[PDB]
Amino acid sequence: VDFSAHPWKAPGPNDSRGPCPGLNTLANHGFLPRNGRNISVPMIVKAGFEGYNVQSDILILAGKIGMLTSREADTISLEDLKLHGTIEHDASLSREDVAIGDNLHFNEAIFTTLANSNPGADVYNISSAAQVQHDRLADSLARNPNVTNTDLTATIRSSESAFFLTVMSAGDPLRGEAPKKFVNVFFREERMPIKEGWKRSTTPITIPLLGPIIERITELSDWKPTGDNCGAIVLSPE
Amino acid sequence: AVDFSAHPWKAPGPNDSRGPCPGLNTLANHGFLPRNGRNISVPMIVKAGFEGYNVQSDILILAGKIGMLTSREADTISLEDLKLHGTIEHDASLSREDVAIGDNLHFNEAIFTTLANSNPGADVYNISSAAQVQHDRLADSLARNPNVTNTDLTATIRSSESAFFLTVMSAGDPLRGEAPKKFVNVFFREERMPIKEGWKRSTTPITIPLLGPIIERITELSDWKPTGDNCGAIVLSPE
Ligand code: HEM
Ligand code: HEM
Ligand SMILES: [Mg+2]
Ligand SMILES: [Mg+2]
């Protein structure tokens, strides 16, 4: 992996970007196509390995679910992933709920909750991620009459916290903690925080590595389901 | 541009991967998909279904990407992978047994007795008879399968599959919502395009807008109602 051959570039109007900081950051570095188009599961598997040392087990599983969001046979544009109720969910860390705002773009007012978490410490961790999930869900339950909160959205949310905690770690992703200086750049700029001192994990990030972090965040989050608790996903756009 | 003479039916070998879907198994039996049933991608399905049946990309991209969930591979399946229960594969099939009480993969003539003897007095199967068969097959599963799953999603998939055989095996106008029995029976029993019987590829493209009203008509005629867990949750991956 030569990271100097993968410089960050800001997206312009030819560049599709979605609700996922992980994939948007890979596109901003050219590990995925910079235009955010014509993205296949094999391209995601390779880009996640090269950029983040994320292994194929999770990227095939998630990637094939994400492909459902487009109208194309075996590719997406990253913006397609905003399709509500496939993967995209309410009570995001950095986006608004679709019923009451913009479910696509980074939103600093939403991000405030994560940004102010684990106060006095230099890291986010499992405990602070759980508290943020609790507080984000409580915000959606208070303000969004159309909130969807189910076993499946709760699991996806904890997967996403585990992703930022592992991929943006100081080098040992097992530990379930990540420097704030790295995670904040990842979200706010969709940039690998290389200038700040981040490096790609030398440990493969796999389903067995993520699973305990996901389950422990859920356990500490004081979570309950809402409504019919139906794990049905949206299988296609329009 | 399709040359059917270059696509002869050959009986599948015991080692050729085949699934629960007569549409894709027939395409493989004619070499529109690989005859071994392996290494099949959505683009391959789109091309095969266009060439073989005049089924357009909208419906094959939608179905195909859901089918891709049934394998552990990045962008392909084997046909047999599509037997994964609760992705697309469902109870109350027209020609297969429910997985909890039998074989959910192979054509079963005993199960097929219901469809084969439907629309009595006509030489076609139609929207009304397909609806009645869906009612009767679901009633069988509700009676005999203690693990039966019947949701708005499974009911819609079942109507879609009836609409597929009525349109693709039609006597040439798929809008009619009827297909000759002599064609449909070969399609199911042999997973063969009934070319010597007089079947020809539709000259009307079969699309989501074409199918939608047929599917809705089959559903309403089938007298379907929710019975239990009505959550349209699918199985998103093998274990
Ligand atoms: C490659 C490693 C990946 C990392 C590090 C990553 C990270 C993240 C994070 C941290 C979020 C939460 C954003 C928020 O709550 O505001 C998220 C959201 C999302 N990710 Fe990813 N992700 C990755 C891969 C994937 C893949 C493969 C897909 C699908 C192909 C995907 C689809 C999504 C979608 C649709 C959302 C929006 C969910 C929501 O917040 O409503 N991600 N991702
Ligand atoms: C190409 C045109 C297609 C036609 C004409 C067709 C036709 C059918 C029909 C008539 C059945 C019902 C069998 C029964 O109930 O015994 C069926 C089942 C099935 N089809 Fe297809 N199909 C096509 C394409 C597809 C595609 C693209 C996929 C997925 C990639 C697929 C996956 C399935 C599966 C999994 C089943 C089993 C459902 C069940 O009966 O439990 N089909 N198909
Ligand atoms: Mg969201
Ligand atoms: Mg079945």
Author numbering:
A (entry chain B): -2 to 235
B (entry chain A): -3 to 235
Authors' own words:
Unspecific peroxygenases (UPOs) are enzymes catalyzing the oxyfunctionalization of both aromatic and aliphatic molecules, including specific products that are difficult to be obtained only by chemical means. These enzymes form a group of fungal heme-thiolate peroxidases (HTPs). Hence, they share a proximal cysteine residue acting as the fifth ligand of the heme iron with the phylogenetically distant cytochrome P450 monooxygenases (P450s), present in all living organisms.
The asymmetric unit of the rMroUPO crystal structure includes four polypeptide chains that associate to form a tetramer composed of two homo-dimers in a head-to-tail arrangement, each of them stabilized by an intermolecular disulfide bridge (between the Cys227 residue of both molecules). Each of the rMroUPO monomers is compact and spherical in shape and consists of residues from Ser1 to Glu235, which displayed clearly defined electron density (only lacking the C-terminal Leu236), together with one heme molecule and one Mg2+ ion. The overall fold is mainly helical with eleven α-helices and two short β-strands (V120-N122 and E174-P176). Moreover, a clear electron density could be detected at the active site that could be unequivocally assigned to an acetate ion from the crystallization medium. The heme cofactor sits in an internal pocket with its iron ion coordinated by the sulfur atom of rMroUPO Cys17 at a distance of 2.4 Å in the lower (also known as proximal because of the cysteine ligand) side of the heme cofactor. One of the acetate oxygens is near the sixth coordination position of the heme iron. The Mg2+ ion appears coordinated (at 2.07–2.19 Å distances) by the Ser89 hydroxyl, the His86 (backbone) carbonyl, two water molecules (wat1 and wat2), and the carboxylates of Glu85 and heme ring-D propionate (neighbor Asp87 is not involved in Mg2+ coordination). In rMroUPO, the dimer interface buries 825 Å2 of each monomer and is formed from the interactions between residues of the C-terminal loop and residues from the helix α4. From the C-terminal region, an intermolecular disulfide bond between the sulfhydryl side chains of Cys227 and the hydrophobic interactions established by Ile230 and Leu232 contribute to the clustering of the dimer. In addition, residues Ile62-Glu69 from the helix α4 increase the dimer stability by polar interactions of Lys61 with Ser67 and Glu69, and by a patch of hydrophobic residues at the interface (Ile62, Leu65).
